[PDB]
Amino acid sequence: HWGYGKHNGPEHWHKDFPIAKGERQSPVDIDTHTAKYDPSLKPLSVSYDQATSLRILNNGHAFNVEFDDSQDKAVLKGGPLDGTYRLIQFHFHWGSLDGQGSEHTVDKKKYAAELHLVHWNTKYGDFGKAVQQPDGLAVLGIFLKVGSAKPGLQKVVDVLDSIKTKGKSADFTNFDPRGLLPESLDYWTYPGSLTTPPLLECVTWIVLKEPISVSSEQVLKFRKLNFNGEGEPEELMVDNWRPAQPLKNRQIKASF
Ligand SMILES: CCN(C(=O)OC[C@@H](CO[N+](=O)[O-])O[N+](=O)[O-])[C@H]1C[C@H](C)S(=O)(=O)c2sc(S(N)(=O)=O)cc21
Ligand SMILES: [Hg+2]
Ligand SMILES: [Zn+2]
């Protein structure tokens, strides 16, 4: 099945998911000089105060922190979005090396990692219905460079030992996702897709311009994660990013 190596990687995915070569694929390169400031963008609203995490999960591709989304608690609204999108989970993609790992790039510059906070459009009643919709999801993308530690990330780093291999999960309640955000909400936005199979074209992308900084030793611990399940040969979870895809006519709008 799909993965990130030579034989099952992003270059192979189109075979099971033809949409891989579609008209609104993610990620993209953000050409900062070509993105237009857009005055009809409302201010962005990230309300994460009442966010309730349930658990952390290694799914053999990344690790997912999953949230209770049965009630309106953690929502993204405003910016390019119409109505209310509920936070359901977040995850990261990262590299074997500090100079690679993000999915989006900024004038071709790759960051050490990229975090994705995933929200679904509440007009559609459940997450399952929204992903079948062109405006079904909003993903908040955040870059990670290597520098000083992100204190608000270390509870995630420490729990990773518990979820080394595919299929492992741990209780992970009361994680507050606000500690992962940078100061600025300046952003680029574009219409796009899931960056993993099924690569569905249901995503409004909102990518923060300001990177967060994490320590060398924090990213180093991401890299100790395994793609494999318990008691299979050891394949380190690194370089789980999809490269930039063709822009194809789309415009990237800047909020600033
Ligand atoms: C959690 C990351 N995802 C994902 O499919 O990872 C692996 C598959 C595994 O597929 N598989 O081999 O059975 O799903 N999973 O076992 O959690 C999906 C899951 C769901 C479709 S999601 O939470 O709406 C989501 S958003 C993104 S991203 N990178 O564009 O911001 C990606 C995803
Ligand atoms: Hg869709
Ligand atoms: Zn992602």
- Small-molecule binders: the ligand CCN(C(=O)OC[C@@H](CO[N+](=O)[O-])O[N+](=O)[O-])[C@H]1C[C@H](C)S(=O)(=O)c2sc(S(N)(=O)=O)cc21, mercury (II) ion, zinc ion
* Separate helix tally: 3
CATH architecture, by name, is Roll
Query: Which structural class should the secondary elements be placed in?
Result: mainly beta
Total number of strands: 15
Beta fraction: 25-35%
Subunit structure: Interacts with SLC4A4. Interaction with SLC4A7 regulates SLC4A7 transporter activity. Interacts with SLC26A6 isoform 4 (via C-terminus cytoplasmic domain).
Binding site for Zn(2+): 91, 93, 116
Cofactor: Zn(2+); Co(2+)
Site (Involved in the binding of some activators, including histamine and L-histidine): 89
Quick rundown:
This protein has 256 residues and is mostly beta strands.
Which tags fit this structure?
mainly beta; Carbonic Anhydrase II; two-stranded parallel sheet; binds ligand NKX; binds mercury (II) ion; cell membrane
